[PDB]
């Protein structure tokens, strides 16, 4: 069931914008409320163009199928605001509102740019639950990073940004499209630039999760002082990245070791990763979520 952009309607009497909460080369994100019920939504606004059509449809088709999982921000619907002949129309994407912002932002606003280890373990576990849902449905995210992990005002964790995700049709199937964000890309995805035979699968998302854990621990991905072109040369050649400080637990160090195995056929699968002690053993979840929520509110 593929979306047909021509059938989308003007949102005239259904939602109203409230405040602008984000902006980038993609468009704008707004806080919005349903005018009839008052319920809260985020609304992403992009103007329409044939040139960005394929990614738009992939985002909407992926969200409609999978966003009902509690670790994926929920899709509510879409509209197209109709503007006069000289002016582009705009697509509105109506989503579950994630009021705490991104993990990248959380790190930026923290003293030393380093989260507490128990916070990192909780966030990583929530990301893996989302990945598990996706991988079991033959989906590869392909752009896992702190900018695409959001937090609600109650410290729930939600994955976003499905525009370059891959939908396979067989379990064993593989992909070869050279796509991602450089510092978080897996060595077997990078290899597709110069190697027209290379392939990757769902384990490339697990590499990116490893880089995102390092992002949370140290404030940036590895090689953040290299130009992107040099990072892309060094990721397949350097040994796998490690945490700089010996103060982290052996558990955390072991988990980073499991995500960042360079040989992807020897990298553990999502299910095995879910059983790692760093992820599996969190008996103080209630306390951790409270501390995260309070830290989030402290940082404004």
């Amino acid at each position: 069931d593929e979306i047909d952009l021509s059938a989308l309607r003007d949102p005239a009497g259904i939602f109203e914008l409230v405040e602008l909460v984000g902006n980038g080369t993609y468009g704008q994100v707004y806080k919005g409320r349903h005018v009839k019920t008052g319920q809260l939504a985020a609304i992403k606004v992009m103007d329409v163009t044939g040139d960005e059509e394929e990614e738009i449809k992939q985002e909407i088709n992926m969200l409609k199928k999978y966003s009902h999982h509690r670790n994926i921000a929920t899709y509510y619907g879409a509209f197209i605001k109709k503007n006069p002949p000289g002016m582009d129309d705009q697509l509105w994407l109506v989503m579950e509102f994630c009021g705490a912002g991104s993990v990248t932002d959380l790190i930026k606003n923290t003293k030393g740019n380093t989260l507490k280890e128990e916070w990192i373990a909780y966030i990583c576990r929530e990301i893996l639950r989302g990945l598990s849902h996706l991988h079991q449905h033959k989906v590869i995210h392909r752009d896992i990073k702190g900018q695409n992990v959001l937090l609600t005002e109650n410290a729930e964790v939600k994955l976003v940004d499905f525009g370059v995700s891959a939908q396979l049709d067989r379990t064993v199937g593989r992909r070869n499209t050279f796509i991602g964000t450089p510092y978080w890309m897996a060595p077997e995805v990078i290899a597709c630039d110069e190697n027209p035979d290379a392939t990757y699968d769902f384990k490339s998302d697990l590499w990116s999760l490893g880089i995102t854990a390092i992002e949370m621990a140290e404030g940036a991905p590895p090689l953040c002082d290299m130009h992107p072109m040099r990072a892309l040369f060094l990721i397949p050649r350097n040994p796998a990245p490690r945490l700089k400080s010996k103060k982290w637990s052996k558990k955390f160090q072991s988990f980073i070791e499991s995500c960042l195995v360079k040989n992807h056929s020897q990298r553990p699968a999502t299910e095995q990763l879910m059983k790692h002690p760093f992820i599996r053993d969190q008996p103080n979840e209630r306390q951790v979520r409270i501390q995260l929520k309070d830290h989030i509110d402290r940082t404004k």
Binding site: D143, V164, F178, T181, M185, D225, P228
Partner: peptide, 17 residues
């Protein structure tokens, strides 16, 4: 990078140099 685009990849997201 922040803004660096290489072929079909997203923006660098982390850097420049």
């Amino acid at each position: 990078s922040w803004g660096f685009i290489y072929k079909t990849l997203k923006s660098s997201g982390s850097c420049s140099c």
